[PDB]
Amino acid sequence: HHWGYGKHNGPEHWHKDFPIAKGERQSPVDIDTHTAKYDPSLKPLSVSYDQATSLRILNNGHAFNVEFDDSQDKAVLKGGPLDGTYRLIQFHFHWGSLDGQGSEHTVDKKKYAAELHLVHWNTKYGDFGKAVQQPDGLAVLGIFLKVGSAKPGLQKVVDVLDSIKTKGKSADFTNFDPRGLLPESLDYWTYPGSLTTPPLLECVTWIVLKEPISVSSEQVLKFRKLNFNGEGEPEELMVDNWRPAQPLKNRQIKASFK
Ligand SMILES: C=CCN1CCC[C@@H]1CNC(=O)c1cc(S(N)(=O)=O)cc(OC)c1OC
Ligand SMILES: [Zn+2]
């Protein structure tokens, strides 16, 4: 009886195995655009993905993760609210059964069709497992997806999903360029928070881009053909793999833009 996104094991149950689920800095949150304050002291974010080395794509039973070589400073996130250098380890998405839900963060209670998370770790802690034990260990770049025009830079991801339908399947996924998943603007909101999956560790500086990317209906329909189950098991479509907004508590969301 492991955690997941069903009736019996979904987000309202997680606190029993992971009591931090009711903690002081949980994610995701609703971004109230009228209460977020412009912070002129933040910087421009620096997203340096030209040397990124993707390796593999894995269906982990929750989402699919595109994994990178993080054994050197190749694809790194710096600036904005961050001090130091954060290495890209993996990206994944959260999405819905229908276009009106899927994102984890919300904007004035608006749900997007999906949300991309680019997960990076703070090199001062040496490895990812040490970083997730620190309050400043991870930086997650979050990007909303709306349904409209296709995202050309996403199609290589879409076209490999048939090969990783079920939990525990992986495929070679070399030479994928994550720059093709970014919107034009790097305007963002930021706040201190958590992993949105168990173990829900309070180790994340969240950086959520204001500008969504557009993907096609055909692209997101291919996300919804994945399976939470392993091969040969009763089919459970991989949909609605999002945690809902959590209480903001004693936190301020800051804006990089006026
Ligand atoms: C070294 C320990 C930390 N490990 C322990 C098992 C998962 C946890 C790592 N969690 C993540 O990387 C992880 C984080 C997120 S999220 N939405 O960025 O918090 C999602 C995910 O899979 C959809 C993840 O699993 C790979
Ligand atoms: Zn995520």
What are the residue boundaries of the structural domains of the chain, listed by start?
A: 2-258
- Amino acid identity of 2? H
Ligand 1 neighbour 238 (Cβ under 6 A): no
Q: Which residues of 125-139 are buried (b: 16+ CB within 10 A; e: fewer)?
A: beebeebbeeebbbb
Q: Is the dihedral of CA 161, 118, 114, 192 positive or negative?
A: positive
Nearest CA to ligand 1 atom 5: 199
Tokens of residue 182, six digits: 């970014």
Q: Is omega for the bond preceding 199 within 30 degrees of 0, making it cis?
A: yes
Dihedral of alpha carbons 93, 115, 251, 258, sign: positive
242 φ, ψ (degrees, to nearest 5): -120, 140
**Alpha-carbon gap, residue 227 to 232, rounded angstroms:** 11
Is-contact 94 119, C-beta < 8 A?
A: no
Cβ 59 under 6 angstroms from ligand 1: no
Measure the CA angle with vertex 182, ends 253 and 74; round to 5°: 95
Bridge partners, residue 193, by sequence = 204
Write the secondary structure of 102-115 as one string of H (helix), E (strand) and C (coil).
CCCCEECCECCCEE
CA dihedral 54, 55, 57, 62 (to 10 degrees): -80
**Single-letter residue type at 152:** P
Q: What is the DSSP letter of 42?
A: S
**β-bridge pairing 45-48 and 76-79:** antiparallel
User: Is 8 among the residues known to form the active site?
Assistant: no
Q: Which of 200, 70, 174 is nearest to 126 (CA)?
A: 70
13 carries a ligand binding annotation: no
Q: Which residues contact 99 (CB under 8 A, 6 or more apart)?
A: 113, 147, 217, 220
Pair 70, 194: CB distance under 8 Å: no
Q: Which CATH class is domain 2-258?
A: alpha beta
Mutate which of 88, 119, 133, 226 for ligand 1? The one with the most ligand atoms within 8 Å of its CB, which is 119
CA 256/CA 81 separation, integer angstroms: 9
CA 202 to chain centre: 15
The closest residue, in CA terms, to atom 1 on ligand 1 is: 129
Query: Is 105 known as a binding-site position?
Result: no
Q: What CA–CA distance (Å, rounded) separates 92 from 195? A: 13
Alpha helix stretches (DSSP H) within the chain: 128-131, 155-160, 217-223
Strand partners, 48: 76
Which of 2, 62, 105, 120 is catalytic? The answer is 62
Instruction: Return the structure tokens found at 257.
Output: 């833009």
Declared resolution, Å = 1.3
Total length of the chain: 258
Q: Say which experimental method was used.
A: X-ray
d(C-alpha 38, C-alpha 167), whole Å: 42
Helix (H, G, I), strand (E, B) or coil at 27: coil
